[PDB]
Structure formats: C-alpha cells, structure tokens
Amino acid sequence: HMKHTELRAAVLDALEKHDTGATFFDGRPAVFDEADFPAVAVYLTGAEYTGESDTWQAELHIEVFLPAQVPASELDAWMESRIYPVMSDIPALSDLITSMVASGYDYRRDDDAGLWSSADLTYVITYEM
Amino acid sequence: HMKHTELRAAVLDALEKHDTGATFFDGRPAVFDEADFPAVAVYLTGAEYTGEELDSDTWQAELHIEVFLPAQVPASELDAWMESRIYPVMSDIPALSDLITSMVASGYDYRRDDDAGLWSSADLTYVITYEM
Amino acid sequence: HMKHTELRAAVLDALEKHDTGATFFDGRPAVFDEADFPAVAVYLTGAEYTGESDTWQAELHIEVFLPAQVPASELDAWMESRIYPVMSDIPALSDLITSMVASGYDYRRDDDAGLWSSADLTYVITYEM
Amino acid sequence: SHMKHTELRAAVLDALEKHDTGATFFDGRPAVFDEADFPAVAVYLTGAEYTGEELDSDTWQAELHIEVFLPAQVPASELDAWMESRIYPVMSDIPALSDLITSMVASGYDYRRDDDAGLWSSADLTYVITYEM
Amino acid sequence: SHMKHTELRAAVLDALEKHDTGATFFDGRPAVFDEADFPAVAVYLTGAEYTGEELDSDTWQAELHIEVFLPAQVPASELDAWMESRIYPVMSDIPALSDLITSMVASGYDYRRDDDAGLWSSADLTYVITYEM
Amino acid sequence: MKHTELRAAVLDALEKHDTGATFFDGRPAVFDEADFPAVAVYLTGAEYTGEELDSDTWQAELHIEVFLPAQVPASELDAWMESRIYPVMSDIPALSDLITSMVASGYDYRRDDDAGLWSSADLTYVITYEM
C-alpha cells in the first residue's frame, strides 16, 4: 500500500502481539464505548514533505484511553507495562523509516463530553512515501 | 476559462477517468450525504499574487485533493483509497503541468467533521505556482 | 466625501456599467436576500495611515456571492467574464489612488447559516485621504 | 481636577457636540446597543500603557477611538457620510485636545459590525496619542 | 509566616480600605457582583513567576492589578473618577507595599467588561513588580 | 516509568504532613462539593531532551494545585500553600533522588471558567529527569 498504512500496521502488530486486553484503533477515534476501554490507538499527525529529497516528517502517536475520572498512574501503568517496552525494538517499523526520536508524553482529556482520559506517547519520524 | 477552473478541472478529469466509484466535488463541501461516500473534493486555498518583485500573474496556491468517508472508518480505509485511486494519477497529469509553473508535495493530513462528526477525511496538499 | 466613498463608488459604477446581472452592494453585508443572488460587494478592509500628503493603504475587495449549491467554477466564471476584465482598467479609480497591485483570491463560505458561497478578489491600494 | 483620560475624551466630545447633538454620544464603547440611540457616536481609549520605561519618562501611549454606529443594513457610504460631515473634519483642529497630549497621528479607519447579534454597523476612526498622566 | 503574595495584596487593601472606609473590597478577581456593593475594588496578582535562573537570583515578577467595577453601562469617566479620588492618591505612596518589594513601575490602564453576562464594566490599573518570596 | 514515581514521591510527602485534604493523582476535572480542600499533583509538557551518553533526559512541568470554593479570598489559598505545601517542597529526598534538577517556575491563581464552583493556586516547578 502506501507508507502510512505500513507504519501504523507495524506498530499496531507489535503492540497487539503481547498485550491481549485492549481494543486497538487505526487512527485517532472520536467517540468511545465502555467495552472499548482499555483503548489504544496508533496514528499520525502533521505529516509533511521535506526537501530543499523525498523525505517526509510526521508525529507518531500511541495513545491510551480510559474512563474520565481515573488517576494518572492507571494510564502510566498501562503505558509502562504494555507499550513503552514494545517501542524499544520494532524491526518492522525500523525497516520502513529513516529515523525515530522520542518527543513528548502528554496527559489529555475528553475536551467537552468528559467521557475519557488519556496518555499520548509521541515520536517524531522521517520516512519516504 | 479562468486559470483556477482549468486547474481543478484537469485534476478532476484525470481522477474520474481512472475510476468511477467516487462522487467528485469542485470545491470543498460543508454538508455531506451518506450516499456520496466515498467522496473526493478538489480545491484551492490561499491563492495570492506573489510577484511584487516584478513577476507577471505569478500566483501561488495550495492544491487540495481530499478524500471523504464515514467517521468510523480506520485510517487505513482512507489511505487505501488514496493509494489506489489518487496518489498514482497525481504522479503524471500532463493536462495539469501544462497549466502551472511548479508543483511540490506539501502535506497529508487526517481531518474530521468537528461540527457534527459525520465524516472523516485525508487531505493531500500540493503547493503550485502559475500565471493567472 | 472622503476618499473611501469615491474609491468604492468608482469600482461599483464601472462594474455595473459593464455587466448588469448582479445586485451590487456598497460594503460587505451579512444577511442576504435569496433574490440578491448573484450579489457583488465592493468594500475596503485594513485602511491605515502610512506616513508623509496623507498616505494611506487598504485592501480592496470585490466579492461575488452565489448560493451554496454552486460549484467553484460558477464563481470563477462570473469573475472571468464580468469582473476581472473590468479591473484591468478603471481610469476613475486610477485618478483616485497612487498604486494598485493584485493580492489574493479566496473562496469563502457562510459559516453562520451556510446560505451562500463566494470568491473574494483583493488588491492592495495606496492613496491620500 | 479630573483624570487625564477623562479630560482627553471630554475635549473630543466637547468639539464634536459643538457641531451636532442629533446623535447620541457615548463616553467609552457601549457593550449593548439600544436601537433608539441611533445614530450614535462613541469616543474612547484602548491600549493605554506606560511608555517612559527605557528612556525613563512619565509618558503614556494609547489609542483614541471615535466610532459612528448605524443600523446594520446601511451602506458603507452612509457611515462615511456621517464621518465626513461631523467628525473627520473636527479632528484636525481641537486645541483643547492638544493642550492635553504630546503627540497625535492618524492610525486607522475600520468598518466594524455587531458580531454577537447583528443590530449595528460602524466605522471606527483611530489615532495613536502620547501623553503624560 | 505569611506568604509574600498575601502581604502584597494586604498592604494595598488596608491602605484602600483605610483611605475611605465603608467601601467594597476583594482579595482576588470576582466574577459576580451585587448592585449594592458597587463600586467594588479588587486587588490581585497575575503572571507571578520566578525569574532568577538565567542569572542566579531570588527574583520573582508579577502583574499587580487594582481594578474598579461599576454597572455595565456607566460612562467610562465614572470609572476614572473612582481611580482619581481613591486609587491613585493611595498608590502614589504606600510604604508598606514599598517595604515588601524590590521594584514597581506603572504598566497599563485598561477598560474591561463582563464577557459572560454583561452585568458590569471596569478599569484595571496594573503595575509590574519584582520581589522575593 | 518515572512519572508515577515522581507524583508518588510528592503525593506521599504531602499526605504524611497534613491530613485535612483530598489528594488527587493528576488534575481532576469535576469535584464533589465535599472534596474541598483538594490538592492535585500532576505533570504537563513532558518532553524528550536528548541522550546523556547514559540515558534519555526529559523535561516536564510539575504542578501542585490546591482547590477551594470559588468565593474564598486569595489569602486562603496562599495560607494553605505556605503552611502545608511549601514546607514539604523545601525538601523531599525521595523526589530529589528521581530527578536531575528542579527549579521554581510560577504560581498562578486559577478559576472554574465553566461552573464557577472553585478557585485555585497552581504551584509549578520545572524539572529535568531521565526516563
């Protein structure tokens, strides 16, 4: 297919392999269903062409969702337990990109509805389409 | 007749010739109809005169080729439509190149319907230069 | 009257003498009568004092409105055959200003009710109050 | 015995009112508008701020507004017509305003609207002035 | 035993309450008022931050506000009058405030209104101050 | 990961000190009229800053926010900080052990823009640490 699908699939596959207690999403969902939590979504944002070469740059997210009123440690625990480790070595993803560096780690919330709470892990990557 | 119409047109023709399963739009649409999905919109944003350093009719705009589908679909659905129906056509469109002076990939953004959450899309953008 | 009334009046007169199809408005309106369509408005934005003789600057807008249903080409077509031709030479306007240059061409919508759809042609002009 | 800002706006309202009192004059920009106050004129200041900082001086700088309000459906020419007649001309020679400031220069002329409801329409004439408190 | 911020706002509030007794005061910026209470005066801080890192100092910096509130439609000069006969005379000389800070300079004078309701209008006088916790 | 150990070290040290507050791990959005006084410890802006030839260095903003009803005088918030929060932040070995540096940042007074149900003082420090 095109590069973006491969990228998310490589991350989604590795994350799905071990952990077996979460609903995975390809792209960042808008609404949820109780049965979806714990939810984990892998997606891209800000993808853009770079050249002044065929290099593109994007922000890779792996976000964990849980019911609104849950303590930060719940999200962190899921992250430090079923995600962060996987992200250390993913040969599949590696073969598809030219580079990857840690970026941020944000705690987010359901802006209006207030139905969910989350932890968004982000890496900056560069690749060829 | 005006340069913009010729521009949109060329891309729309090349696109709707290769395929025939999508509903094509000339300009970005606000409201959508389930029946229209998968929809493809071709339009321009930010067109401005750039030659005040003396360059005749030298404008610059952002060319959009955005694909639409229902809000629920995964990012792959969109990418799949892009990769199979759009992206290829885009590599070679003589009709187009003969109208502009330059074109370079810009962005690829995943957008959604913030207003009602009815659709989801992938906006492919290019930066072009051309004489009016 | 101040230079602004003369500026707008000149464009309006030249536009209505060349093509009678539209319904001209002096200044940008918000509410529109479904009948007004096709509507055309001539107006100024960003009028500011520039210096040393009282040099000013402003953005001249010539925005044509049509119903939302309409595809972009219908807007482009109106411009190409009824507005643009005219803008190339308006001696009355030329006598009022010191300089004009093309600026932008934007497609705008009605965000409050979504009843109309437009194309907004803009030039930058310098003149003396 | 009055605050500088008051004396400043007052000198302006005094001059404008000498040529017309058919309009309803405001001291400050009105938030809500009463259809019966049309036509209305508002004199006010925005951005007032101490400037003598760096050079060590008791100089303030602010923006002086003189805005004309009319019903929303009116053509831009009508707003200008009121300005050319009773306002713009008065602005070039208000001695009482001079004796209060240290400098004045034209800044802008903007056409504004009632974004919230849509009851009024306007033209706002602004100057940048400097003065001491 | 008392935080610096409390001492700062208290030096001003006491001076104001002392200058003219019986008036309405607020320690922090309120959002709702009661007709009777007007004119209300509020003294508060915003933007307080530690600024001694790039140079190894104990300095903090914050914007000191003394804002006067009145009904939403009063002419702006009414707000200025309170400032002129209550606030400025006091701010001109407050030893207790001086003893608590290291510097103070005039900053701005803004006219603000009730955005969520439109029940009041105000005049916010601000000073930039630096001090030590 | 650090984050949990970071907020824990701070939360723990604060609870041993005073017992009259409802502590939250992370910034809450809706409170119960009975959770006041509330204290929340959380992080924002955590971002990667590079490798120190030994590990990955990060930077985040550490928040300690005390919440009280909307009408309380600003003095009530300050007094709560002065007596129950500052004395603790002055020295928390468990925390000092987890980070590579800490410096005071700001002290903001915040409000419940939506319902006007509360008032707060948000104390923040900029910290650096290895993940």
UniProtKB/Swiss-Prot annotation, chain B:
InterPro entries: GpU-like_sf (IPR038512), Phage_lambda_GpU-like (IPR009312), Phage_tail_protein-like_sf (IPR035934). It comes from the Viruses. GO terms for cellular component: host cell cytoplasm; virus tail. It is found in: Virion; Host cytoplasm. Its main location: virion. Keywords: Host cytoplasm, Late protein, Viral genome ejection through host cell envelope, Viral long flexible tail ejection system, Viral penetration into host cytoplasm, Viral release from host cell, Viral tail assembly, Viral tail protein, Virion, Virus entry into host cell. GO terms for biological process: symbiont genome ejection through host cell envelope, long flexible tail mechanism; viral tail assembly. Plays an essential role in tail assembly by capping the rapidly polymerizing tail once it has reached its requisite length and serving as the interaction surface for the completion protein. Homohexamer. May bind to major tail protein V, and /or tape measure protein. Belongs to the lambda-like tail terminator protein family. This is Tail tube terminator protein. It comes from Escherichia phage lambda. The gene is U.
Curated annotation (Swiss-Prot), chains D, E:
GO terms for cellular component: host cell cytoplasm; virus tail. It comes from the Viruses. It is found in: Virion; Host cytoplasm. Keywords: Host cytoplasm, Late protein, Viral genome ejection through host cell envelope, Viral long flexible tail ejection system, Viral penetration into host cytoplasm, Viral release from host cell, Viral tail assembly, Viral tail protein, Virion, Virus entry into host cell. GO terms for biological process: symbiont genome ejection through host cell envelope, long flexible tail mechanism; viral tail assembly. SUPFAM superfamilies: Phage tail protein-like (SSF143749). The keyword Ribonucleoprotein does not apply. The keyword Cell inner membrane does not apply. Coiled coil: none annotated. Plays an essential role in tail assembly by capping the rapidly polymerizing tail once it has reached its requisite length and serving as the interaction surface for the completion protein. Belongs to the lambda-like tail terminator protein family. Homohexamer. May bind to major tail protein V, and /or tape measure protein. This is Tail tube terminator protein. It comes from Escherichia phage lambda. The lineage of its organism: Viruses, Duplodnaviria, Heunggongvirae, Uroviricota, Caudoviricetes.
Curated annotation (Swiss-Prot), chain F:
GO terms for cellular component: host cell cytoplasm; virus tail. It holds the Pfam family Phage_tail_U. Keywords: Host cytoplasm, Late protein, Viral genome ejection through host cell envelope, Viral long flexible tail ejection system, Viral penetration into host cytoplasm, Viral release from host cell, Viral tail assembly, Viral tail protein, Virion, Virus entry into host cell. One of its GO terms (biological process) is viral tail assembly. It is found in: Virion; Host cytoplasm. Homohexamer. May bind to major tail protein V, and /or tape measure protein. This is Tail tube terminator protein. It comes from Escherichia phage lambda (Bacteriophage lambda).
